[PDB]
Write a protein that binds this ligand. Structure first.
Ligand SMILES: [Zn+2]
Length: 257
């Protein structure tokens, strides 16, 4: 289809998805001596309802926890946005080693994994589908995940994986508010950017938390144990799903702090 291995991986993605070499692609390296600070950034506010949590899904290169997105029970407001973005899923990226699984890098420094929390613009559009391709369509929080001490807040997700082992497998994941995964500081960078895997739409306003969160080495291993294959085939562990940082192409990262 597209994937993360040598032959279908990130460096080949422009072949089929030629936007991969676009000007607003993601991740980036945040150079901190080149961010512009902003008066106008409001503080980020997240208000999620745990009863909108719905299902954990293994999609072969990763997994995702979907939320119910029929209404503004779980929203993202503030920061750079004038209207409310509606939560629809959270997922993680990770790498082959502890030394680099993150997507965003800060001043060249790579973290072990990255949490993406994704919201769509339900003041402007009527579906994720309509919003997903729009410049103002998507809102995504990125949390860098630093290997270190086990992170207790991962437990429910980590314990649910044992039931979505194979590509396609899915399962109810309920009563979870994923604002418990964010760092306690809400400092962030924002830049105009993209989906980090294919379709690669340039539709994401990114929110990179300044502060990292923890993940232990063994909890990363749990992510890597997930299988990219369908039950009954050869086991193919999900070693990694992180995209190299892209060129800023004249964009500016704004600091909130
Ligand atoms: Zn992602």
């Amino acid at each position: 289809d597209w994937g993360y291995d040598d032959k279908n991986g990130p460096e080949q993605w422009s072949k089929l998805y030629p936007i991969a070499n676009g000007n607003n692609q993601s991740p980036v390296d945040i150079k901190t001596s080149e961010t512009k600070h902003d008066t106008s950034l409001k503080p980020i506010s997240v208000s999620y309802n745990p009863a909108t949590a719905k299902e954990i899904i293994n999609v072969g290169h990763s997994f995702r926890v979907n939320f119910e997105d029929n209404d503004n029970r779980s929203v993202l407001k503030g920061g750079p946005f004038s209207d409310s973005y509606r939560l629809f899923q959270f997922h993680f990226h990770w790498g082959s080693t502890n030394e680099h699984g993150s997507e965003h890098t800060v001043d060249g420094v790579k973290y072990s994994a990255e949490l993406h929390v994704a919201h769509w613009n339900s003041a402007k559009y009527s579906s994720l589908a309509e919003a997903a391709s729009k410049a103002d369509g998507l809102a995504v929080i990125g949390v860098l995940m630093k290997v270190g001490e086990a992170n207790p807040k991962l437990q429910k997700v980590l314990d649910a994986l044992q039931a979505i082992k194979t590509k396609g497998k899915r399962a109810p994941f309920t009563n979870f508010d994923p604002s418990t995964l964010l760092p306690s500081s809400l400092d962030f960078w924002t830049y105009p950017g993209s989906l980090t895997h294919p379709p690669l739409y340039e539709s994401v306003t990114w929110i990179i938390c300044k502060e990292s969160i923890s993940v232990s080495s063994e909890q990363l291993a749990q992510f890597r144990s997930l299988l990219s294959n369908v039950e009954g085939d050869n086991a193919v562990p999900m070693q990694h799903n992180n995209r190299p940082t892209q060129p800023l192409k004249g964009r500016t990262v704004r600091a909130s702090f």
